[PDB]
């Protein structure tokens, strides 16, 4: 049987113009890669700020069409319309937005935002939708007084939780979680992550979990994917990546994570050299300008994912070591 | 090739609607030319057949659009001059007034409707909006005669009515363009330009009054939606003077409904200035089209609606292009 | 020396043969052209124009005109005359309008609307050039009004020398668009719907104008015309709105000139419609109306109240008949005799446009409605745009319709014949559908008969029989008012509704 | 304890209160409506009865005026006050129907145009450019030829010349909103096209439409007055504020009241619909909650 | 002190039933200090920061005994004189960058305004210093990405544009509202090393509001822990997390993934925050606290000053052992 989600070589590129009559340049926001996602499983996505993760999340959610590659849900092509399927496929794949304030309609109350998923997709009467909305709000540490509020009369970590509540509402098969816990304190983060893990165990809900906080990914993930400059650089099980990181971007990334105990604290790699541009990405390996393991092929050829014991790594120095 | 889009369906729509509409109105140009007198049945049938009016409306329409496709708008049944040579001198006088009215109405209506939002609930807000809705709800005949009687007749500050001083004439031997503010500035004698702008003041005030209240209210409403947004909080916090938070940050986001009403009101200022043109004796398109419609001068109603329709399509296409300058997200 | 006149709207063009509007004749006939014979200013009286002398045959079928020596034409940037005025110019001026094979007949659309409306196609048999300075009109029947018809604006004389110069130059429309005439002024400019500039013609055969140039400032609003006149932007104006007349009487900077106008406003009863087919009902609906109140209210004192169709200042007026003067009591009694004391509904059609003869037909219909109301007749005011009003009125769809006439030529035939004759019924201008034999047998012989006393006698009888039969309310004759600056000398008000400037001085 | 739940109406009224001008506005609108519907129980006289001895009798406080006619009389001697109060009937009705129908169709077409974009938008925008080009008198004469002389055929002519303004202002708002993340998030929840434009986007578009509807009452009377210079308007003895102003504009420098009181009746009803519009903006504004 | 806040409170809603978003907060910052603010989502940290700048709008009401900056008590002076003090000498990094940048101007315009107001250079100097700042915040291609609109930025780029725009103000005090939310751990470390070299060289004050306990422990000099509108603990950054003085700070540190097994359920306080209608009498932590005495259910604990200079808003300030 096919995976619950299966991406193959997904690309997305954005037009940019310096002025209304200027030449239309192309931003390489995702020159991306395949993945398989199975039921009851979490795939975390980690990497540089601006490296394409939210762009990937928009493709998987069907917010945008890709500029290339394929996207299957359960063996059904998501990139062509089918009216008998699309009503079900729409409720079965859902998102938690990054910076979710702009994703909450300012002229709506939080109860209306959380009931809308139910009102479109279910038979639930008014009292049963209010019951579901308040029940989901309670499970993220909101309150019956918040159901009546407009989205600007909250803190950012409460807007995160309104976006989580809306995403988890439907019993979906996949949730694309775009920075879902970053504006939460560690006690509310623990409550939300415990809810996401309880739903993964009870419902079979899978996650694509986009996070910059590595301490959370080291806990919730089952597979982890590392991204740089629109492309994937390493993929494996969570033990493989956190115990033996092989791509020198992953080594520099995992090395910079803050840790509360003073002893545990270590010097970051202090990557030095010009950053690569999404408008003209360098020939060959994207990281070459800042990489410590410099070697001949890197400035010339595009590296690709090789197996090395199920740990997919896209690096010529790891190929030379092997 | 041309940028308008839908060029064939647009032309067939404007022309078939205008043609079928003027030919549904009861009466004929011959019947109205005769007035209270009779025209005998045998001479009425002759003169309709000579103008081409006895044929069925499908044949008459095809003959008209065949002529227009080959570059001919026809002959005006009032003036006996081609509809184009009648249109151009009047379109020029209508642009010259509609531009002065819009320059006044925007140059006053942008500052005043910004201040009415910045100073909400003040004596200024209620006075500026009250004054604006006063000018908006007087008939142009009453408002225009109040200005003529006060400013021109009592105060002696302005000329009464007309385009330029009645006994001062330009030479036709100079290459006149037909815009008196241009013509008198380049080829007029001493004081002749000052006279041409002195005749523009009251017409521009009266015609620009009905845009000014839309611009004042629309800019004020749009400002009140913007001044509470999180990026205006950032502009206040960045240490900018209040003039920059208002003019640079807020007004830029308020302009989109404002440039929409400027575009809609320019459409009215081409087609519909008739009451101001009547009071101020202005040789514009509004008097011309309504006199043609009343006389059943079918070529002038058909050709004038097509040449007003094209200028409206182009102004609406320009402000639709201008939305992407105001709000880059729309591009 | 310069005069500025504030015109009521704009001219349709500059050949007066093609056009029906007085605002065109003021721009295009009076200043630019002469006619064979012409009206003495302020009167109906015909005096020598381009003909010094004329003779009528004993049968009335031939009119001979002896043309004036030394009459010379205008000059234009495309034309200078070699000739004075010939009989050939007179012949072409009327052959253009009558003859389908003439070079100029179809030029500018061939809409010779007065020539054809007066029946001159039927009447004029020939236009003969007797000699270089003599012209003959031969007529298929005699008509006494014909000499006054040759005094109208369509009878203006056009140059054959210019006409065939423009025809061999391949541009015949210049005869109509770039005018050459014999008149006291020549056209320098026309700025479309704005202003007209004229120069006094230095070679004119009459008295040369005492103003060197004349300007029409086209000013379509009657209240703004008085503002231009108050400020001395303008020295003369037409058609003052009735409300300002009171103020103008008091204004020390102007003379408000007055003349009993040769026009009539009337409400026309459709005799083919069941309540109005009875003379008693038409008399009652007349007795029921307070005309003096309509004069004070609608006309604001600008009219004089009307008892029969011909204006009181015109020849042939029957002053020896007494009106159906306001008497509601009398009105109610006369509908009881008709069997209509139970009342009836009636349609009262009112034009939305202003007229010389009726300044507001809506508020007049609202007064006739209240007047008829008090007598038990339920008047319903109906109104249509002017083209639909003319169409359905000629088609006979109305019960009563507001109407009027402005005298073309000052002859009573121009009224009775054109408004209440069987012929007029045929052409659609008999808005009463009234054919009465005893009226016809008077008004007809009075058209043909040359004896002015017999015309006066038969028209006096036509007014007696028409008053007894009452085919209309006859409401009022408008006084024509001409606000003129005190600095203007020699102005005289024309009863035919034209404006003249050749005898006018500024000092 | 928690307060009583507030119905939308309750919230709307509660937040409409805070604007002292907006409730002065609604009080006037209910006063002219009460005066209009009950005019036959309140007006001094029957309109279309003429006091022929008193033509242009001035207001009761002027020299030669009389307490018999508080606001004086017109040029046919009718009471200006009785004509204003019966004149509130047709003027409020055609003003409200023109604004209601043009706002309804303008919202529908402008939502469809801005939401769907592309060929739909181009067709719709071309259509409303053609409607801006057609003179109002031409539409009026055509509607009279199809449907006969009626007050409703002036209301339809006035509806179609006003409709472009609502269509284009609605589209201009919808083009900003359709790009924002809450439209996307509602699409991901499963909202179809009707829910997206009418339930989710439209609440964010009202600030220009409240301005246009508040101005659109003035035009529905003054352009009815401009048609009233010709054969289109009310049946002549029956009062309407725009017609009874257009009939008397030659009495401006003499007899000032006949123009001035219909002028005040329109001006106040315009000024005070604009005060209600500010209150309706404030009551729908979440930042004021 | 540079900033001196005393009895600060902020209320939302009608005066009759105010929501105490900030509730007798009192703290100070010296020139060159870094102050961390830590606490539950909804505890008043943003609203406190907005109140000390006057950026709370009509539905909210601000009050204090003292609210003074650089020798001026900001409530007594004219709003004109408050504005031209606070805008010239104070800067803020707001929490959501997507709504805080103006939608209709390029990144370069929005940064170069700050350089013009606060530094005053010509247009070519303003571009060069904007490239220098965009390089300091590690934007991938600064000379092209000046000419980019906020909707074309990623969330962690728009965040770094407003860090650059705050540093462009050359301020005396900087309030940083979760300045590392949308940032990867490598660029997060660059931003903190940038803000601290700025504090060390230009002697500026810094206020780090953050949920990342490890980052504020490394960076801060003093930490303020905040709950339900009140300060609950205050003291030296290297002390607060080593041995905490308040049951809230203890239960917050217990929630970290560092103390949990490879896939297991994380620890947390077993309850929900007090709102408008269910606010305790006495201590605000009453229904959640493991150590709640009936004195807590009766009496509002004072901000009790301890022998080691640190403060705890508890009747029973915790020992080094982690017990009452
Ligand atoms: N609509 C757009 N138009 C142009 N450029 C865009 C657009 N949306 C995103 N980008 C660019 O696409 C690239 C990838 O951005 P993202 O998809 O947000 O990357 P990302 O890894 O999710 O970054 P984070 O997680 O949001 S910090 C960046 O260079 C963006 O500036
Ligand atoms: N306009 C408002 N009306 C009502 N409540 C509001 C309003 N704005 C904010 N709140 C409340 O203000 C309290 C404090 O909000 P913030 O200061 O923004 O929260 P915070 O401590 O910064 O939490 P984080 O760090 O931003 S998740 C929260 O409990 C909100 O419920
Ligand atoms: S391919 Fe070379 S430059 Fe790229 S990550 Fe590997 S070692 Fe570094
Ligand atoms: S005072 Fe009591 S309830 Fe409050 S934190 Fe201390 S032990 Fe807990």
Residue numbers in the entry:
A (entry chain D): 9 to 330
B (entry chain A): 6 to 336
C (entry chain F): 29 to 535
D (entry chain B): 11 to 299
E (entry chain C): 2 to 325
Reproduce the article's own wording on this structure.
In Gram-negative bacteria, the full Dpp transporter is composed of five subunits: two integral membrane proteins (DppB and DppC) that form a translocation pathway for substrates; two ATPases (DppD and DppF) that bind and hydrolyze ATP during transport and a periplasm-localized SBP (DppA) for substrate capture. The Dpp transporter is primarily responsible for importing dipeptides but also capable of inefficiently importing tri- and tetrapeptides into the cell. Different from those structurally and mechanistically well-characterized ABC exporters that solely consist of two variable transmembrane domains (TMDs) and two highly conserved nucleotide-binding domains (NBDs), the ABC peptide importers require an additional substrate-binding protein (SBP) that captures peptide substrates and delivers them to the translocator for function. Unlike the reported heterotrimeric Mycobacterium tuberculosis DppBCD translocator, the E. coli DppBCDF translocator is a heterotetramer, with a [4Fe-4S] cluster at the C-terminus of each ATPase subunit.
Structure reveals that DppABCDF forms a compact pentameric structure with an approximate dimension of 70 × 70 × 140 Å. A DppA molecule caps at the top of the two integral membrane proteins, DppB and DppC, in the periplasm, and two ATPases, DppD and DppF, adopt a closed conformation in the cytosol. Unlike apo-DppBCDF and ATPγS (or AMPPNP)-DppBCDF, which adopt an inward-facing conformation, ATPγS-DppABCDF adopts an outward-facing conformation with two ATPγS molecules bound at the interface of the two NBDs. In ATPγS-DppABCDF, a striking rearrangement of the TM helices of both DppB and DppC, which form the substrate translocation pathway, results in the opening of the periplasmic substrate entry gate. The two ATPγS molecules act as molecular glues, shortening the Cα–Cα distance between the D-loop T182DppD and the opposite D-loop S190DppF in the RecA-like subdomain from 10.4 to 5.6 Å. In particular, its α1 helix and α2 helix interact with the C-lobe and the N-lobe of DppA, respectively, whereas the side chains of two conserved charged residues, E41DppB and R42DppB, from the scoop loop form two salt bridges with side chains of residues R383DppA and D436DppA.
